[PDB]
């Protein structure tokens, strides 16, 4: 919860394009998405957590209660069912759509925020620092 609050800027990315290919994102969308380098803004209000990502391409925003399933529209256009829980100090998100699923983990590492995405074995890691 609290350790995640703030504005974060992307510093490094690994295998993100490979992850998007596994998810099924198209060539053009993968291209613009990779050039965008969106930030990440996390805030909490009562029991609702909000994660916002801003970029010149598209801004996305989700507000949720930890443990309650909700509808989410991803940056690449998928309409998925999402659920986010707090486990071992990390935010663990599972997205499900058309019989498929992917996991997105957000955790703290030193003074950084690390996002790890997994799709059928393919793993991508993105590191952020406080802006």
Curated annotation (Swiss-Prot):
Question: Which GO terms of type biological process are on file?
Answer: brown fat cell differentiation; cellular response to lithium ion; cellular response to tumor necrosis factor; cholesterol homeostasis; long-chain fatty acid transport; negative regulation of DNA-templated transcription; positive regulation of cold-induced thermogenesis; positive regulation of inflammatory response
Cytoplasm as a keyword of this entry, yes or no, is yes
Q: Which gene encodes it?
A: Fabp4
Q: Which organism is it from?
A: Mus musculus (Mouse)
According to the UniProt record, list the residues that bear Phosphoserine: 12
Cellular component GO terms, alphabetically? cytoplasm; nucleoplasm; nucleus
Record-annotated disulphide pairs: none
| InterPro entries per the UniProt record, alphabetical | Calycin, Fatty_acid-bd, ILBP, Lipocln_cytosolic_FA-bd_dom
Family to which the UniProt record says this protein belongs: Belongs to the calycin superfamily. Fatty-acid binding protein (FABP) family.
Record note on quaternary structure: Monomer. Homodimer. Interacts with PPARG.
Tell me, what is one Gene Ontology molecular-function annotation carried by this entry? hormone receptor binding
Protein name per Swiss-Prot or TrEMBL: Fatty acid-binding protein, adipocyte
Q: What is the effect of changing residue 66 to A?
A: Abolishes export from nucleus
* Chain positions found as Phosphotyrosine: 19
């Amino acid at each position: 919860c609290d350790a995640f609050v703030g504005t974060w800027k992307l510093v490094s990315s690994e295998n993100f394009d490979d992850y998007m290919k596994e998810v099924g994102v198209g060539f053009a969308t993968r291209k613009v998405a990779g050039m965008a380098k969106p930030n990440m803004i996390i805030s909490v209000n009562g029991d609702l957590v909000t994660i916002r990502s801003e970029s010149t391409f598209k801004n996305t925003e989700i507000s949720f209660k930890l443990g309650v399933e909700f509808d989410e529209e991803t940056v690449d256009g998928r309409k998925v069912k999402s659920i986010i829980t707090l486990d071992g100090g990390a935010l663990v998100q599972v997205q499900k759509w058309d019989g498929k699923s992917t996991t997105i983990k957000r955790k703290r590492d030193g003074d950084k925020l690390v996002v790890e995405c997994v799709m059928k074995g393919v793993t991508s890691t993105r590191v952020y620092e406080r802006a």
